[PDB]
RNA sequence: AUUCCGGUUGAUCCUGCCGGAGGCCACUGCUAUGGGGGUCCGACUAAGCCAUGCGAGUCAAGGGGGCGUCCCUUCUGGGACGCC
């Protein structure tokens, strides 16, 4: 329980500064699902470090893109690094962030922090015609997302079929806990930031579909942790 | 695998085409130890031209003959089974 020990260390050696951090410190909120759907603002990474400690794992942290941007001045070219990264345990929860820095290490650290701040909660299941099982191995139903010019449509896939999507989508879905999916993309997918944000938006939009109580049993819908 | 990646800018986002990555067929460089199965091998240009050999024969129980052998009456002439 190394991650539990890490969570406890973050709990004692930490002084909360926000209302949500105070709630976590005094124990009013004890589960990760309790900080969502209430309108709370997340501004302290210690909240995520305590509730969902697995996000600090090396295998649970992924660096998606590194870009070298240039700004022109009188003297010459000023170089900045933009790093797009994603974090989250491979079960129910995922987050994406962008960090800017003068050096790649600083940019990576800031991107990881912002991803932890931007963590969200998704829903999983099985809605494929060829599987019809009730395990949370895929998206429960077809979902859509978009950012910039990129439009991504995720379709449920049969169990045992790999993530049929680009590499960025593969990494994001693996971090989110999805194992099988089909994809249809339009627009400039070579724009890594837009592609990642579109996949993230689709995973978030999986929460925007109205469902009946029997659909949960039919598709094995699992919200958050399984 | 219902998928992407490189390229227009000092840097960014688009449209747009070009190129990478897979499968099948025809020529082709280098190289080569075997065995099975199949509906593969002058179709692409010339349905252009050909030496040579072969690629439609069979029937003697439809008919008259010729050669051979045998059995002979025994100059006569008769009967056969072989080949043409
Ligand atoms: Zn299934």
Best CA proximity match to A14, nearest among A42, A50, A40: A50
Distance A181 CA to B41 C1' (A): 47
* Nucleotide closest to A67 measured between CA and C1': B11
Distance A221 CA to B33 C1' (A): 59
**What technique was this entry resolved by?**
cryo-EM
| Radius of gyration for chain A, computed over Cα atoms and rounded to the nearest angstrom | 19
Best CA proximity match to A176, nearest among A165, A190, A191: A165
Beta bridge partners of A77: A72
- DSSP letter at A115 equals H
Task: Give me the residues near strand B, CB below 7 A.
Answer: A 67, 69-72, 77, 148-150, 155, 161-169, 182-185, 187-195
- DSSP letter at A37 equals S
Q: Which residues contact A189 (CB under 8 A, 6 or more apart)?
A: A150, A166, A195
Matching residue, tokens 């895929």? A138
- Residue spans of beta strands (DSSP E) within chain A: 62-72, 77-87, 93-101, 120-121, 123-124, 143-147, 150-156, 163-164, 181-186, 222-223
Cβ-based burial of A176 (10 A; exposed 0-12, middle 13-18, buried ≥19): buried
Please tell me whether residue A26 adopts helix, strand or coil conformation. Answer: helix
Token couple for A76: 């010459």
* Nucleotide closest to A68 measured between CA and C1': B11
Enter the resolution in angstroms. 2.6
């Amino acid at each position: 329980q190394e991650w539990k020990e890490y969570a406890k260390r973050v709990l004692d050696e930490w002084e909360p500064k926000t209302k949500l951090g105070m709630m976590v410190k005094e124990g009013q909120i004890t589960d990760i699902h309790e900080i969502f759907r209430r309108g709370y603002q997340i501004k302290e990474p210690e909240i995520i470090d305590v509730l969902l400690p697995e996000v600090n794992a090396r295998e649970n942290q992924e660096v998606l893109d590194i870009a070298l941007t240039v700004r022109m001045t009188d003297s010459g070219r000023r170089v900045r690094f933009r790093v797009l990264a994603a974090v989250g345990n491979r079960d129910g929860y995922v987050g994406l962030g962008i960090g800017h820095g003068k050096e790649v290490g600083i940019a990576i650290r800031k991107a990881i922090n912002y991803a932890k701040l931007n963590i969200i909660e998704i829903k999983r299941g099985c809605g494929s015609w060829e599987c019809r099982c009730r395990r949370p191995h895929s998206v429960p139903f077809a979902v859509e997302g978009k950012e910039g010019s990129v439009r991504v449509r995720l379709i449920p896939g049969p169990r045992g079929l790999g993530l049929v999507i680009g590499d960025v989508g593969k990494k994001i879905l693996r971090l989110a806990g999805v194992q099988d999916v089909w994809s249809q993309t339009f627009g400039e997918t070579r724009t890594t930031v837009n592609f990642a944000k579109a996949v993230f938006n689709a995973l978030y939009n999986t929460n925007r579909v109205a469902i009946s109580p029997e659909m949960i049993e039919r598709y094995g819908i699992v919200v958050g942790r399984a």
